[PDB]
């Protein structure tokens, strides 16, 4: 039984991927926007009160009741939120989120001794930064996700000017790594996708989806680490709580410029932030961006509360010079929409924690379970059941399968060995298959493909 | 809040009373002289005291100003008795006003010659008056915080304070007895190295005995008492925190790289010129001179005899950037002088970077617009006054370069300013003599505590 | 040696109370500009620190230092602050105040000894509503203060037209108790002064100080509440915690109109409050106030944010009607100056929580300690210190004593015995004298008084 | 010498395009930030003062200012200003700006007949800005810019699918009307240019730029008018006081559907506009304009205070169907980048004023003089100075100029008379040409070959 609280910036997309559990899933968020939304966009519980009295805990049970998500803005009354429910109503699995970070610091040796109150089990909503770091190191890395228990990874790269990329033909980066099995799933380019084997690279902003075992993949991630030159100018335009932590975490090993609109807020940055030069103007004027060589920057990271504002401001500098654009998207319909080539990566804190935390999560398998990304593309790991016969798809080879246009199989996993399905497909498979689709609005038919003749 | 102030007044100045048998027992201990007047100024002054501790039962900002102008004031003219009373040094009472002062006002300056040949009591009373300023401007400096100058408590830090003093000029004179040093001498130069005075009982003030160890332990000790005593509070807090919670302190840093660059350069200097036969003893009297005069001491070694006016100049000028603020020193510490430069920087950046928030940041925390804006009414009340003194001293018939070395020496309370008041304040024109007095207020008092009484916005 | 956690509003005020023998106390107040006012009071130590992190907690558990007072503004946060408090260092002398208050209903079941919150005692802000209640209850009882430990208590009544008090000379008050050992301090009438002996009452709002020990006073304003007749309908205008918990708890026994300004507040308060008329709009208006028989209201309770609309809406009604008019002042320079007549109460909630925690103090023992009242009158509780004749108080008579001018003694605690001030009385070593002055800039004359010979 | 009086938004665009060309410049910057840009540039002379104490006045005209540019927010003030100056310090030709409708509605005819002297011009920035309904009016009209003195017209019209541009090569667009001499001057599609002669115009959706005397322009676009289907239905996004009376100028010809986010300016707005149905909601979530028939509507406007979130809006509709979208873009450096791809028009109320005025008043004579626009593309207007051989461009062959890349010569202005360029054409001194790039990275370039030998 799965309970989350209120209100919940991120919670209630955790409400969302959670809910596939067979058994009984409940949400309670803080008041109205719980409820009302929650109702209108939600499924089957909930819930009411602020937090965190104990009266609204005992409606999630706490009767070998088995989730408790304690999604929660501030930390001090998180702690107390959990413990409420474990000594009055002893919720047995208890996780907590702390920002504190000074608590953060010290509960490794702290909340690691049994005696701290209730929630042994963490997740901060500000380790997403470390994965904006990642992004800044691996250079021209736009997305990975894990499917199968993180066996397979599909992995979109970009292919800047000057990069190992450029003039290579797709042959000669086949060639460079031997020792790889790895499955190129298509390619974007201005937009459109095209067929990529034994094709020249071009230059300009090509989007290049790699798909293969995770040792595969953190092999050729290195090697595109060790060719392209590392970055070296990063600018930010939010005084977030994300951003100034970003800005601590960056301004050691990159030179960093960060741009605020209130003056108090950078007044208190440029005390705080060491090495780090802190700006005081909006992050539209082109005045400003210039005037601050917005021509030679290599990454330009919005982490701005608005989002449009992200997406504008990042536009603009990516029309301006910037190489590397990232924003800070709060609605799935805007990177579903905006961010391609314009923008090369938006970081929905939804989607960070899910996409790792679905893969781990048991057990995803679904006749279609989606991990979505930027774009129309999709990525899938469809589960083919039925026995030899009553399936479209077991026991036949994919090129003789009737699959979707634009839909390429990347991999196919079964147990713990991974095939990159090249030609006939010689196949095990009850087991699960790994897919690309370029246009997503065929994933219901995929579906189809795999669901048996119903009963 | 008028007539409230006589009560503490009186109190003090009985303290001071009370001071006074120290020295007196001293001269009983070895009867060179000055018993007497001793003893008559002990009672005159519990006397005065008691007149004026008659308004009791009555207590109640501009307060405080008038109460450390008297801590200075009264208490100078309160020590100006002995040097009146007693018959081995005969001296004018402007005299006596002046070395009472500038005892006690901690600038080095003294209009007594034959210091050597002088009843032991009186020499005592001069160090431990310069002792005695030394505990009053540390205790002033680091326990009233209105102008210029984690929270720990009032009291304790009251008491740290006094044991750093003590722990200091024990190892101190410790240091200089086991060096060859009078015990007598050791005590009384211990009184005046660590307080930062400049005074010693013998006509030279480190010539008397050229012991190069001698000269190295008050480098050494000059250096520990020019630094911030907040600093060794650290290092004195649940015993010895850390060796570099010195480093920290970006103050710490800009003083030894002022002692560093002014040392090397001297004796460079010192070399070019061959003004000593051997490198090293030009090394040490550098080394010496240096430390004494940038750090507002007033020591001397030399006569500046072969070395070239430039060296003695450029000491001059180093006494203005003085000692740190948390400890004993003359005007301008090193502070001012360290956001000075800072605040050049950030000008600079400035105009690279125009559209860019920068703020005055020390140790990592920032400075509000206040503070770094009272800094430059500071440097901007000091030159104004440093003008006026300087005019004063030469309409009283003073010689001009000669007024501007010993304004610059009083203003920056050291002792000994180069030209004609080379190593004493005797044949100074006697009004020259009463400026001078109040120069060495203004400079004790930070130019703005005593300067606001003038202010007619104030009364 | 004493902590405190000055986060919130009143701690600064206890902070100034507990300053004296063997005391130390460090404030861990969250921000510097309330530090800069508390930091004025003499022999401090402050340090800036977030309240509940280790760091600031590890200075105060290193060394147990005796009693926590973990004073908040927020809950939780107080909570989670005693808790990593104990669990990291043990201090068993912690205290806390929650101003939570669901959860001082379930206080018996999270906070006892052995479970993980580990709050030992609770200090809410509530007291002044109960007080304000136990005001509401007593018809005349413009105030009460307590000396010595709560063994004699000062008590400040009105005498209304048409009461019991009205036109009866103090000796057939005298002699309606045979058994009650009261002593009149000082009687203010029209203003001014007077000297209380054999004196008829004079009707027009004639206010009376006893002092006794605290069994007599619990008699005589029992008595009195059984007098007078009890007041039937009652006003208040504010819609914040205390005007709705203290609409809640009198509802139920007098007739009840609550005044809002913000429409929202009103609406969300007619659902909570029942048998409560909840109304909206501004507390100056007559147009609402005369509307709403503020000519038959008998108590006005001004419980608004600002302290000038409260003084000032409830000078209107007083004017307009009301019999007792009572307001909510947060500045002390405001409650000495208009708790005078026209307003009949002011209540501090600062003076409010310490009354009823530093009563518990095991003394005062100050050469002269002093309890703040509606001015311009003090009462203060004198220690006699001092040899037979090294002091100017100790073993001489009460008839003999040079007493500043308006200076009565009250009463006389020995040991734990009271005894009430006849001028027979002597005083002797360690004895508390109970005190009352008319003009209160004669309390250092007193100390002076009671200040020995300087050792 | 020309002084403008503004504080408003739109006086400092004002400030660049019509002053400084052979010509003393006065400004009022009443006090505020535009005087600080312009005074950073130094080519300016400004005073500071109220709209219109006098004092100001004198200084700025003394019965010798010439003429007067009143621009203001407030009208009741611009008409006190306007009149001021005319009674004490006499001005000529001033003018006012009214943004409010009632004043506007009833001017005829005692204010400029009359007694406040608001002689000639009375430029509202509203009605000009109205002329977002003639786009809807003529379907297919991105965009119109105005050369010379409205005498030659460039035209961006778009091919929708289904319209009647597609298919048809270029050449049958020129036969369908052999009356009219027009020359499309450059074609973009999907963001890449094209030399537009004999090739078909491709269904997906292409930009095709007429350039032809004013006369052609206007009997091309009510042909266009004819031919294309009227779009029934629009749909305004918001409340503003724009938006407003967009939609009462629009409801009785079109069904008009508009959002607001602000309930009580919702309420308002159902209670003035009849027959438009008003909402209350972001402009940003699907579930409203999906649930609003998103995917029908064929006008999206976007009238938002913030123009990042006018873009987004639009950018989303436009992704859900809509065949038309607009913005309001009150930021140079955001239209130029979006208006290119994916919205189709955005109206700077700026430039809305500002070309009705400087076309109309202003005969632009600074060398190549331009007009900015959407994309890349800039569409400028040289004179051709110097003698047959003393300029690189006069007396010689449009086919015989080295033109930088992308640059097309669109059409020849000689005095009165227009004509379409031709290879085959001569230069003449002195005569108006209006050109088109497609990079406008190349403008300074034109200029060395527009700019005589130096004397
Ligand atoms: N161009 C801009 N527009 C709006 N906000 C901006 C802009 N540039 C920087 N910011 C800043 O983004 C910061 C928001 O960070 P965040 O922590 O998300 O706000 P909050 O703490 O309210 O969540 C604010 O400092 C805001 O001023
Ligand atoms: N003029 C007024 N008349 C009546 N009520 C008022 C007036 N002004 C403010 N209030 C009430 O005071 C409330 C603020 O009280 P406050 O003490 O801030 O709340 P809390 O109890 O949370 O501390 C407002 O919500 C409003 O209901
Ligand atoms: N997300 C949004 N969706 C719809 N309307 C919005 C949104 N944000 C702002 N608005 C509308 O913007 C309008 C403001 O414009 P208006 O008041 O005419 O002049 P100003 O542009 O100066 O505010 C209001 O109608 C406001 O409701």
Redesign the interface.
Known sequence: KIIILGAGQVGGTLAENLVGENNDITIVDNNADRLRELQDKYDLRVVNGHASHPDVLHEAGAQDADMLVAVTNTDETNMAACQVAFTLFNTPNRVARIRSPEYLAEKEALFKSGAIPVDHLIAPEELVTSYIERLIQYPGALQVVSFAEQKVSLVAVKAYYGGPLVGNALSALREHMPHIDTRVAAIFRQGRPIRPQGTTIIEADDEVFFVAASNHIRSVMSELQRLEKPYRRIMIVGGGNIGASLAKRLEQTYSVKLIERDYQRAEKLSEQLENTIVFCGDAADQELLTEENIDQVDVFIALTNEDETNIMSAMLAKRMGAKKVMVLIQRGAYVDLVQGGVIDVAISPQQATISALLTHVRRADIVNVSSLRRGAAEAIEAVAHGDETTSKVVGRAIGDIKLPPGTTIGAVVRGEEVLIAHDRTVIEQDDHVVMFLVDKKYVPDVEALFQPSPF | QFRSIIRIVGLLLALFSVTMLAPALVALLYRDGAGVPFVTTFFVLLFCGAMCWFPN?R?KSRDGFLIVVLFWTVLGSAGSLPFLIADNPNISVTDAFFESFSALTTTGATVIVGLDELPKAILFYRQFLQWFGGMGIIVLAVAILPVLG???????TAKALWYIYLSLTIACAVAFWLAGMTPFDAISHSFSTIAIGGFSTHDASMGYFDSYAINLITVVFLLISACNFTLHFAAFASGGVHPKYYWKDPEFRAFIFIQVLLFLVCFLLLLKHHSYTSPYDAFDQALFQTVSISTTAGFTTTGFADWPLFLPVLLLFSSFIGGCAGSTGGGMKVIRILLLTLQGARELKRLV???????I?VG???LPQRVVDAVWGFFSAYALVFVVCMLGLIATGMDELSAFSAVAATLNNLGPGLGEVALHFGDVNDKAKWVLIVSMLFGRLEIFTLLILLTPTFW
């Open positions: 039962r207590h984690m929270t720990p408590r009032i009291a304790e970077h125009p559209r860019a928030v920068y703020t940041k990592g925390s920032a």
